[model samples]
Target: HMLVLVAPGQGAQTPGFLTDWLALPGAADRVAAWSDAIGLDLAHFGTKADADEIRDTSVAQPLLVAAGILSAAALGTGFTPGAVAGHSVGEITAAVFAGVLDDTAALSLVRRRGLAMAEAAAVTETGMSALLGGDPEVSVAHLERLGLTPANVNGAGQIVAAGTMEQLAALNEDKPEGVRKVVPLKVAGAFHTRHMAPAVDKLAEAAKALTPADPKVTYVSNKDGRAVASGTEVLDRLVGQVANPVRWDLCMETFKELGVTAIIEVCPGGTLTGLAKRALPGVKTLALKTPDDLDAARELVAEHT
Candidate 1:
């Protein structure tokens, strides 16, 4: 049984999720240093910011990443993961966990990504919605008819459709057959679609200046849900990922093939852990959402790996 470390995407944070985490020793100072590197006061946003303030993509992206990285530090330094994967923006956190990108470098990149994506989002009237419990092709066909992109083909009976707000309305009116729910999400705009194109180039420009190293553990990617051994390849895929669909369904398939014993979703978890609970029924799962969950996560990792 091998353990896989997973990171959650943006939109995973709730207001003040970091309040309990900051109560841990040195966690406050660690967050401050990360905030300084990224030029954003993460401690304020993560611990005290209101719901609407935290929902802004510019704030959510960096805040989510810091929560994962900082909370993982509380797990102490002796643990080693067997494999790692991330959903959407969480890939940056996974990169750091895999030893491809250091925490500072990862935080720096995520801060820029948040800003660029937020700017792109503000330029259009687009958004995303979840169409759960339906046939994959049938659901996708319905979305295509509505001029939507399946931004997140998140396996386990869930697909997130994104496009113009008008298209989203069309989807709401014409729900796909067999789908029990078509709930609109709270995300900013159409991500993993052409709407995110503007952010891709900005991220690419930033990525070119830094060099990435090979992962210390098996690194699964959202590009095609495959294990990417080279750090350079992982970073390249992350840049392209902005404007392309996230193939999380495939990633879970890869995890099953790799014989993953347990999956640990990093702090501010829930999303990925929920997916694993549905998609990888054979694997044990843990969502490390707060400080109290760290001891449990460490134990899960130890027993699995």
Candidate 2:
């Protein structure tokens, strides 16, 4: 029964949840310092900001990183995780948990990543939409026919299709067979697609400024779901990840291969944990929603790790 610690990506943040975590001793200080380092008011954004404000790519990425790091820190120091993986921007947080980069270094990099991606989004009116409950094979082909990218190959019968506005409009008009619903996501642009090439360039340059330590635990890449042993390569992949599909389905496959018994997602956690319930049966899953979940999370870690 191996334990894998995970992190959720954007769309996991809900208003005022950070308020609860901030109430805990030393939590505010931790975020305050990160805000200064990352130059984003995480405390304000995570609590005071509404859904629309937090939905901004520039704001959401760093906010999730801060929340992930804070929630994991609250879990105490008695546990050593067997492995770690994250979705989209959550990969940076996984890198932090894997000890490939310190919190300051990780947050600094994410801040730049968010800004670059946000800028990239402004150039064109591209977007992404979720295709719920469809055959992956069929959904992918249907999307390709419309010139869409299956941006997120999330298993459990979910796929996020990304493309320009015209292509997305075509998808809205022409649904793939067996797809239950197509909800246009609130995200600013078509992320994880060629539209993000400019962001990739910025991330590559930013990555060059930092030195990374090798992961202390199994580090799974979203690119191919392979366990990455080298920290330098992890950072390299993270840069390219901007313009590539997120192979989370494969990451889960690797989790099963690693004998992952219990999976714990840091704050803003439900999205990935929900996917695990459907895809990886028999694996105990926990999402750290707030300080209230801390006791349950600690018990799970003790039981598994």
Candidate 3:
């Protein structure tokens, strides 16, 4: 049996969620150090910040990655995963788990990525809407005809469309055939779409400065769900992926191909696990929403690994 560790993307953070994690021994110090180093007080954002405050692109991105890194560490030593993957910004977290980048570097990179993407998002009134229960081909054609990007081809009867506000409005009025409904996401901009093109250059510059190591474990990508063997290619894809669609549907397929038997989604973990439950049959899943779930996660890891 094979085990995989996954990290959640943005929108996973909530108010005062870090209260428990900070209580763990040394957890406070590690987070604080990271906060000072990155110039973002993660403790403030994770603990006392309100929903609107944490929803900022910069804050949410780093906070999610930081929580993932911290929670994964809290899993304690000796809990090794057979492979690692992350959704959207969480891919940075996956990089750390795979030994491709150290914690500080990953945080620094994500910090820059968030800021750049935020600046780009400010340029337009664009957003994403999830289309539930539709044939992929029918969904893609409908989305493209409306000038929308299928930003996230998330499996399990979900396909997220991203485009201008006008186009999104059009989609709502004319739903895709066989689709249940179009639910608009809370995100500020159309991520993983052409709207993010401006952010790519900035991310590429950041990526150029850091040297990465090849993944120590199987590292799956959202671009195509393929396992990338080269560290430099991973960084390259991370940069270019800013303006591309996230093929999470393909990622799940690769997970199946790799024989993933159990999956653990790091803190703020419900979203991906829900997808896994419906998409990957017979596979066990554990979402580490809080410290209370650590023991169960460890036990699950033991069984699969």
Candidate 4:
């Protein structure tokens, strides 16, 4: 059976999401090692023990990456994915797992990426919102009129538009019945949009300076649905992805074409599994969010193997 592992992006984070993992044997020590590498208390960030620190981008990016990696570690040796894909920041973790990057490099890249994006956010008044149940054309027209741009084509009937707060608010106010709802996302900036061009440039420099290794498993690119064949392409795509639309719909289509029989989503949220179920109906989809879910995932992996 072809097993595919998927990772979610930034907005999936929540306070106390990592508490159970922390309680697991060796988990705390692993977290401490990561903390030393990144020079931050990741455990506290994941637990969100403090309300005042909820939205800090520095904490959020690494926290989400750590959560995904921690969940994977919890799965132990019983699990191995045939292929892997990740959305936005989750790509870093996916790359590491795929052997395209080392843990220290990935974590360090994400930390800088978060800070740079945050800096970009401060200069722009842009944000993003989920536009549910609408034709892409109609949404595009409406967003165009409101000076917004489609940032993510997540799946059928699910798209994210990014623009200045004024434009997004206007689009929300004038939304049609086809739109089920406009859910504002908590993000540092209008990621995957022109608003992050500066961040993209900085990230591109960083990506170029690093040596990218070939993946141990097939790795899908978020910039488009195609499988990445080389490390240089992966690095380029990742840097460009900062200001380009996330073609997740295409990614799912690629997964289907590859005949992916089972899917496992690691950590924090089950958003991608829900998307996959609807996008690839016949495929078995599982979202491993907690230690219990990780255990379940291991059993599933063993069975598939």
TM-score of each: 0.96, 0.98, 0.97, 0.94
Off by over 4 Å in 1: none
lDDT by residue (tens digit), candidate 1, 1-305: 78888899878898899999899988898889998988899999988889999998888888888888887788754788888889998999999999999988888888888888888889999899988788988999889887999999889867899999999988888888988777888877898999999999999988976789999999999989999999899999988898899999999999999888898888998989898998888889999888889888888877986
lDDT of 4 by residue, 173-216 (tens): 98845887888988867888889989987887677658989888
Q: On residues 30-140, what C-alpha lDDT tens digit does candidate 3 reach at each position?
A: 999999988999999999999999999899999999999999999965767888999999899999999999999999999999998988889999999988787988999
Q: Which lDDT tens digits does candidate 2 get at residues 1-305?
A: 79999999988988776989999899999999999888789999988988778888899899999999999999974678999999999999999999999999999999999999889989989999999777999999999988999999998877999999999989988989988788899888999999999999999888988999999999999999999999899999999999999999999999999999999999988999999999999999999998999999999999887
Error of 2 at 304 (Å): 1.3
TM-score of 1: 0.96
The predictions' CA RMSDs to the true structure, in order, are: 1.3, 0.9, 1.1, 1.8
Model 3 TM-score relative to the real fold: 0.97
Residue pairs clashing in model 2 are none
Which candidate leads the pack in TM-score?
2
Error of 2 at 12 (Å): 0.3
lDDT scores of the candidates, listed in order: 0.88, 0.92, 0.91, 0.83
Model 4, residue pairs in steric clash = none
lDDT: worst 10-residue window of model 4: 46-55
